[PDB]
Amino acid sequence: PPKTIPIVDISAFIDDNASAQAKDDVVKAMSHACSTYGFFYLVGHGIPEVDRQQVLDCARLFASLPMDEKMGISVSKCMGQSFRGYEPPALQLHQEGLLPDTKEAFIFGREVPADHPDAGRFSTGPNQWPSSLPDSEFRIPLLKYQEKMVELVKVILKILARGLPKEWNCPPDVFDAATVEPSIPMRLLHYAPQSEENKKQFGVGDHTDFGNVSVLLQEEGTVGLEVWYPPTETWIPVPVISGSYVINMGDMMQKWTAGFYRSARHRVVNHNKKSRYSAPFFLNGNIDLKCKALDGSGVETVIGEHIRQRLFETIG
Ligand SMILES: O=C(O)CNC(=O)C(=O)O
Ligand SMILES: [Mn+2]
């Protein structure tokens, strides 16, 4: 029974003039992690710690808004199925804050104009921004961070492509077409503290991510995140590690690679005595891209259709 998920330092791919043996070591480590656990800590990404802390501060700033203002940009009011804006708690009573055992989020993605023909299609459309927050304090750093997340997942994808079975003869750029005009939702999540009830409580229940790559920024604090490892049937805890992101593969990556890279069930247990924040970035990818199974098996899957199928099947 493994006690931890692996750590991968990708400095060799971020820094200049790294040896080919160092790069190959990165490739092998990431490939093994993603084909065994579907999860790993990533360090060496080069994103300044001040930028990461600024993102968590944006999460806290948004949550501090009163409920009526947040509800003003509720995801109910977004365009079509773009799913942008404020995702409210399941229960609420007051303008300020959250009831225990609840959560809220701000969700934003790639900015697509309202008059664009694709606007309102799945995960595609204009963002909703809270008008009371100054741009220098919210929208601007979030969009700059989104730029950095896009660069990071492109590097991750190149490492993943170099880690596929050699008999498949996959180029290092096999995944790159998913990163053009992609669905890239990011959430600023606020979890309330646990309640006093004497039953297990979760910030997120048992699930898989549906997309390609997920990039999670955690806040210093209690362990929430756990990863289901089937062979030993055990939940691996994923504590916060300074400087790292938690990376995991989603269902679309698992489909694309014919099961070689695993999309693992995970959950967040609520052991927080105070509000906790997190910021996951999700590469779903170009919703219209037709992905052929990389083992040459001739199977074809459209990213948007796959994710909508997963949403329709993930009901109860
Ligand atoms: O906040 C966390 O620890 C993990 N987040 C998720 O699984 C999610 O937002 O889908
Ligand atoms: Mn998840």
SS3 letters across the chain: CCCCCCEEECHHHHCCCCCHHHHHHHHHHHHHHHHHCCEEEEECCCCCHHHHHHHHHHHHHHHCCCHHHHHHCEHHHCCCCCCCEEECCCCCCCCCCCCCCCEEEEEECCECCCCCCCCCCCCCECCCCCCCCCHHHCHHHHHHHHHHHHHHHHHHHHHHHHCCCHHHCCCCCCCHHHHCCCECCEEEEEECCCCCCCCCCEEEEEECCCCCEEEEEECCCCCCEEEEECCCCEEEECCCCCCCEEEEECHHHHHHCCCCCCCCCEEEECCCCCCEEEEEEEECECCCCEEECCCCCCCEEEHHHHHHHHHHHCCC
CA 216 to chain centre: 5
User: Is the CB–ligand 1 distance for residue 163 below 6 Å?
Assistant: no
Resolution expressed in Å: 1.9
Distance of alpha carbon 26 from alpha carbon 52, whole angstroms: 23
Contact 267, 234 (CB under 8 A): no
Closest atom of ligand 1 to 268 CA is 3
286 within 8 A of 183, measured Cβ to Cβ: yes
Residue 253's nearest CA partner among 207, 215, 211 is: 211
Closest C-alpha to 110, from 74, 136, 146: 146
Looking at the 3D structure of the chain, how many domains does it have?
A: 1
Residue nearest to atom 1 of ligand 1 (CA): 278
Task: Give the residue whose CA is nearest to atom 9 of ligand 1.
Answer: 280
Minimal-distance CA residue to ligand 1 atom 6: 204
Residue 204: CB within 6 Å of ligand 1? Answer: yes
Residues 6+ apart with CB under 8 A from 316: none
Ligand 1 centroid vs 204 CA: distance in angstroms? Answer: 7
Ligand 1 atom nearest 282 alpha carbon? 10
Q: In what order do the strands lie in the sheet with 225-229?
A: 202-207, 266-269, 225-229, 234-237
Q: Quick check: CB of 109 below 6 Å from ligand 1?
A: no
Q: Provide the CATH number for the domain around residue 28.
A: 2.60.120.330
Strand partners, 188: 106
Tokens encoding 146: 């989104």
Which one, of 189, 257, 255, lies nearest residue 218 by Cα? 189
Tell me if 220 sits within 8 A of 272, measured CB to CB: no
**Is there a domain that residue 1 lies in?**
no
* Residues facing residue 145 across a β-bridge: none
Backbone angles phi, psi at 162, to 5 degrees: -70, -15
Q: Is 113 part of any domain? A: yes
264 lines ligand 1 (CB under 6 A): no
| Distance, CA of 22 to chain centre | 27
Q: Whose CA is nearest to atom 5 of ligand 1?
A: 280
- Which ligand has the minimum distance to the alpha carbon of residue 202? 1
Beta bridge partners of 213: 249, 283
> Which residue numbers in the chain precede an interruption (C–N > 2.5 Å)?
none
**Which residue from 103, 121, 100 is spatially nearest to 112, judged by alpha carbons?**
121
Q: Which two tokens stand for residue 266?
A: 């995970």
Q: How far is the CA of 169 from the centre of ligand 1 (A)?
A: 34
Query: Which amino acid, one-letter code, is at 259?
Result: G
Instruction: List the end-to-end C-alpha distance of the chain, in Å, as a whole number.
Output: 30
Structural domain span for residue 216:
7-313
Residues with CB under 5 A from ligand 2 (ion): 209
Who contacts 69 (Cβ-Cβ below 8 Å, separation ≥6)?
Answer: 130, 132
For residue 278 and ligand 1, the question of a CB distance below 6 A is answered with yes
Give yes or no for residue 246 CB within 6 A of ligand 1: no
CA of residue 188 to ligand 2 center, whole Å: 13
Residue nearest to atom 10 of ligand 1 (CA): 209
60 Cα to the center of ligand 2, angstroms: 20
Q: Please, what is the Cα angle at 149 between 102 and 212, to 5 degrees?
A: 75
CA–CA–CA angle 220, 269, 63 (5° rounding) = 60
Experimentally, the structure was elucidated by X-ray
The answer to whether the beta carbons of residues 120 and 289 sit under 8 Å apart is no
